[PDB]
Design a protein around this nucleic acid. Sequence first.
RNA 1: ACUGCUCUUUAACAAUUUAUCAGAUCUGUGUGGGUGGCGUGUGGC
Length: 134
Amino acid sequence: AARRRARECAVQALYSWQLSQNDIADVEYQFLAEQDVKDVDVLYFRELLAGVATNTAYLDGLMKPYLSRLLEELGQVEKAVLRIALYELSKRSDVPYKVAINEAIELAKSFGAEDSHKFVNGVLDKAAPVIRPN
RNA sequence: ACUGCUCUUUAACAAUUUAUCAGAUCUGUGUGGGUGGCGUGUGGC
């Protein structure tokens, strides 16, 4: 509710970030200004704002040859969701493959484009090597 | 400590009923166009 789902409490921010292209600090500023969210540990809020570090590219660079399609064609919602889910394990190292990927599959159902989970799960099998000591 | 372990490689068609051989006008700036009603009073004839 609070710890894990925290991600999907602020993927909006990510989305808006990946659409606004402004200062991420002001991004979280306007986001917390939008509503008082209590299903998120503010430490995970700081993680989400830390999810700006350039390895973002690298994590899509992680799958850059491991892609079924192009990158920009992956919608901004999928872009942000997958980018933060890989920011868990590509630079932040929060949890193993099963836990974080169950998260990335369950907490994108109220945002996906009616089929997002199939492709994110089929391409996220790259999450197995990124933590090989699974 | 003590709600939280993969669901498995992206949108997912409406179009529809004789019938066919396709079957000259692109003007104006000539110009009229850019204080009274009523009442009362007075006086006159």
